[PDB]
């Protein structure tokens with residue numbers, strides 16, 4: 001297949017036999033997408049082994065892939081395996097199975113259901129302050145991925161299942177310990193390396209009961225959800241139970257969706273919160289102006305409500321600019337299920353159309369000083385000059401992030417209660433500037449550590 | 456994965472791990488489908504390794520799979536590999552590559568193109584009589600599949616290519632050795648991409664080479680089956696490799712399927728002299744003085760059509776009809792998951808006691824116009840049904856009847872000492888006799 005992009009006249013790095021272009025992943029997804037966007041321009045193609053991957057940067061062509069031709073052509077993501085029973089996960093399901101799951105899980109995050117979660121989240125916002133207060137009274141450094149991960153785990157377990165697992169910590173909580181090692185995509189591990197280079201090994205491992213998710217971690221979550229069924233005694237757990245007592249969702253598919261919601265609520269929320277606090281500490285002018293707005297909307301440390309959060313404009317600018325610099329998904333991918341020609345470009349069946357979100361968020365031909373943290377890009381004065389198909393931190397189209405509004409509300413509800421009582425400073429041991437992990441997923445090399453001062 | 460039919464509540468034999476129910480194939484596909492038809496009923500399921508196979512016998516449900524939901528759900532047969540360049544064959548292609556090839560090769564056997572083949576076939580009918588005359592003047596039993604196979608090869612090579620090939624012809628020798636270890640692919644579905652990506656096939660590379668370079672030799676020009684594929688090639692489109700893939704299918708089907716059924720017909724005529732004599736009296740009536748058979752005189756003979764239909768009932772060479780359920784459906788109030796191979800036991804249905812009175816008996820009167828109203832077109836399916844039935848059903852029926860007419864005008868067939876009576880079917884995979892069909896040929 002290594003002559004496909006040579007046939008279509010599409011530029012790209014020369015692929016090696018069998019390997020393709022995976023040798024260029026030594027710097028990670030991001031640095032590889034950045035160099036390819038500069039060298040080859042608006043459209044380039046490479047090979048993840050024998051898999052041709054077409055990278056597009058045109059907003060109109062991105063809109064056609066993500067929005068217009070979603071249900072008909074670009075419906076599924078890249079086939080990920082071996083998954084085993086997790087194939088029924090909404091992020092992994094395909095075609096009609098995903099269509100049924102998306103409609104089944106869409107009412108989970110309506111504006112009414114989200115507003116019901118604010119009082120529940122307000123409880124753990126108080127525990128977050130007291131846990132930050134013990135470490136604040138001492139000059140001891142604070143690992144923010146630990147304290148934000150515990151807060152995120154409590155919000156996702158109570159708002160989706162109505163169960164309190166982390167009672168003020170319990171810092172050795174088993175849900176965090178298992179969700180931590182739930183998945184570790186590292187190019188170094190020849191497993192995920194050989195899966196991409198030689199994909200015919202997937203049906204071997206599937207029949208061998210081999211799964212990319214570890215057994216002890218799946219078992220802990222598989223039996224916890226079975227324990228989490230306490231009826232007799234409307235949430236993410238009730239929407240699936242009610243539809244189950246009416247195809248329908250089996251007790252194994254109901255667990256598969258819970259694992260996706262638990263991981264996304266823990267890992268993604270805690271990672272972005274750590275990225276936000278790093279920029280607030282390295283930019284004291286932004287942190288002060290954000291604290292001044294929070295006090296103006298919530299005087300005397302007033303409790304945050306669903307309406308006051310949507311009122312804070314500068315808070316939305318800080319969250320959006322951090323998501324621009326750090327798109328945790330990095331890439332958006334769709335599988336071309338049939339031959340099409342979008343915007344005057346033929347795309348064969350089976351080619352993976354990829355949108356480099358990290359490279360587009362730092363494209364100099366869009367963002368003035370793209371490497372700099374400037375929240376003024378997202379002010380209502382300048383937000384008109386932002387293409388929603390260039391800035392896609394949550395994706396776009398029918399298969400975007402279903403928990404986008406929940407993640408935005410959960411993070412903003414955390415930043416408010418934290419900045420109401422504390423200020424953040426570097427520690428010298430804080431890695432400045434922040435080096436990104438040259439591995440698979442978007443993470444810092446050294447964990448983000450900061451000093452916490454009370455007010 | 457062997458708990459699918461247990462989940463769906465569909466009965467069937469208990470599968471062994473990895474193997475499934477393939478150990479029950481020691482008797483053949485036929486006897487396994489018949490034992491499961493009486494033991495379980497209208498619907499049962501088994502496992503060819505890890506592949507669940509659902510067997511349906513309800514005519515309304517058979518019609519839904521073969522005819523109604525063909526283009527939507529039941530479009531392709533069981534995936535067969537490793538093939539290679541034969542993946543483009545019309546019998547193996549899937550979805551749109553099949554639809555484009557089904558439309559390209561459909562005009563090959565129209566009522567006009569078939570009527571053009573009668574004078575061409577009439578030439579080889581005389582050589583068939585002369586070669587049978589040499590073995591009839593001298594008392595020597597005649598291997599029917601050899602003498603019929605040589606006639607069937609010259610017919611398909613001329614009606615599809617116009618080339619004349621005329622006892623050790625390399626085409627018959629190479630086409631026949633497409634005839635063990637398939638027990639593994641039935642158990643190892645994951646080893647198919649191991650031989651596909653590595654470019655390994657099941658057909659030996661030389662039965663393909665001899666035909667791949669023969670088509671490139673017959674393509675030297677300078678409208679038949681070959682000309683239809685050249686004119687569209689000179690306009691997605693068809694390549695010199697896909698063009699060869701279709702020629703192998705037509706050559707094999709025209710040689711092996713025609714001769715095997717003709718051998719089965721003459722065995723029934725020899726074991727039933729009253730049927731052979733009555734058939735000879737009809738041929739002499741429509742065609743007096745051994746008149747040359749034409750296109751219209753063949754369709755006029757009713758008893759000849761009744762003899763061929765009863766033989767294809769007793770010996771359906773396809774044995775089974777199979778479709779792959781491409782997506783979850785609920786036909787006739789029965790949920791069928793995606794990936795299940797819906798199978799129609801044609802051999803078991805052609806001998807169902809709840810339909811055919813005395814099914815093991817050879818009675819051509821089942822297909823008389825008085826009684827042909829009591830047969831279900833979805834129970835008697837010797838050529839399949841629906842949009843993906845036998846594309847050469849009309850050519851095969853005409854070619855075999857033209858051979859039966861030219862022979863029964865001059866010879867009568869009697870059993871020999873070495874004639875296997877009753878005929879034992881091959882307990883292996885395909886439908887064939889154990890011992891070759893040998894019959895005494897007496898001239899008239």
Ligand code: HEM
Pocket residue numbers: 066090091092102260261264265268269272323328329332333392393394395396397398399400401402403404406407408
């Ligand atoms: C800052 C936080 C988050 C960010 C930036 C983010 C980003 C994304 C992105 C870029 C996608 C892919 C969109 C596409 O391919 O078009 C996605 C998918 C998804 N996200 Fe998130 N996400 C976040 C948090 C969450 C949370 C809290 C949940 C809770 C359930 C969640 C659940 C999902 C699911 C289920 C999908 C798959 C959607 C589908 O297949 O229909 N995410 N997310």
Ligand code: HEM
Pocket residue numbers: 521545546547557704705708709712713716767772773776777836837838839840841842843844845846847848850851
């Ligand atoms: C007594 C002679 C024959 C019998 C009983 C027979 C029977 C069958 C059957 C049962 C099928 C499958 C139908 C289905 O799956 O629904 C089939 C398919 C087919 N037959 Fe035959 N056949 C005969 C002779 C021939 C001949 C002479 C040709 C010449 C080209 C031929 C070409 C084909 C092809 C190309 C297919 C596959 C068509 C497709 O899948 O779209 N057959 N045949």
Ligand SMILES: O=C(CNC(=O)c1cccnc1)N[C@H](CS[C@H](Cc1ccccc1)C(=O)NCCCc1cccnc1)Cc1ccccc1
Pocket residue numbers: 048077078079080089091092182183196259260263264268329401
């Ligand atoms: O990662 C590949 C396949 N990629 C390759 O094979 C590959 C290899 C080499 C080079 N390029 C590509 N698919 C994934 C889908 S599968 C993966 C499996 C998984 C991983 C972690 C926990 C649970 C299950 C999954 O469900 N994640 C969603 C978790 C929830 C979440 C996470 C983050 C944000 N919101 C929600 C693409 C993807 C989809 C959505 C968001 C991000 C990425």
Ligand SMILES: O=C(CNC(=O)c1cccnc1)N[C@H](CS[C@H](Cc1ccccc1)C(=O)NCCCc1cccnc1)Cc1ccccc1
Pocket residue numbers: 503532533534535544546547633641703704707708712773845
């Ligand atoms: O045989 C399986 C796959 N079966 C399994 O894997 C399996 C294994 C164990 C148990 N059950 C199933 N498919 C085949 C399709 S492929 C096969 C390949 C082949 C073989 C011989 C010569 C050339 C190429 C093929 O093109 N034949 C058609 C020849 C023409 C013809 C022949 C006869 C009558 N008319 C026309 C199902 C089939 C289709 C049509 C008719 C009969 C059967």
